[PDB]
Design a protein around this ligand. Structure first.
Ligand SMILES: *CCC(=O)N1CCC[C@@H]1c1ccccc1
Length: 149
């Protein structure tokens, strides 16, 4: 579950949750279901904490969203420590980017969420995939930590 396909589906499911368009095909997994609740809570918190910065920028295109994602993500992981709360922050931030793009993207495209999901899955896989596998993946690591007791 640390491979690209699995993480891309998590990132895509989260953007569909934010855009209020869940896919009517099979329905999100147990992992996705737990992640959507935790990531949405962090997203509301980050939206409040980053309000002065977010107002300062207009997310006019996917390249702008990528630049903002890299600047937040580069500082979130610079001390080299990886933990599940930091990984939830990646999804929370992609949710903020898709909201900002929906309102501010100059040339709207219905596939924009798939492009943001791809670069989010690339970041998670390249920067944290090794750590995720060693810590039980999504099913024996993440879900065990964040599912209800
Ligand atoms: C929070 C720092 C800030 O004001 N800005 C504006 C330009 C880039 C940066 C930013 C980073 C993350 C979210 C929003 C803005």
């Amino acid at each position: 579950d640390c491979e690209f396909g699995y993480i891309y589906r998590l990132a895509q499911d989260y953007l569909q949750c934010v855009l209020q368009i869940p896919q009517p095909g099979s329905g999100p997994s147990k992992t996705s279901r737990v992640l959507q609740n935790v990531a949405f809570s962090v997203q509301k918190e980050v939206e409040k904490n980053l309000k002065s910065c977010l107002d300062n920028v207009n997310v006019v295109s996917v390249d702008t969203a990528r630049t903002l994602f890299n600047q937040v993500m580069e500082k979130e992981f610079e001390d080299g420590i990886i933990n599940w709360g930091r990984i939830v922050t990646i999804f929370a931030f992609e949710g903020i980017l898709i909201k900002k793009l929906l309102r501010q993207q100059i040339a709207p495209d219905v596939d924009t969420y798939k492009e943001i999901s791809y670069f989010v899955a690339e970041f998670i896989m390249n920067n944290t995939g090794e750590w995720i596998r060693q810590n039980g993946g999504w099913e024996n690591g993440f879900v065990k930590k964040f599912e209800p007791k």
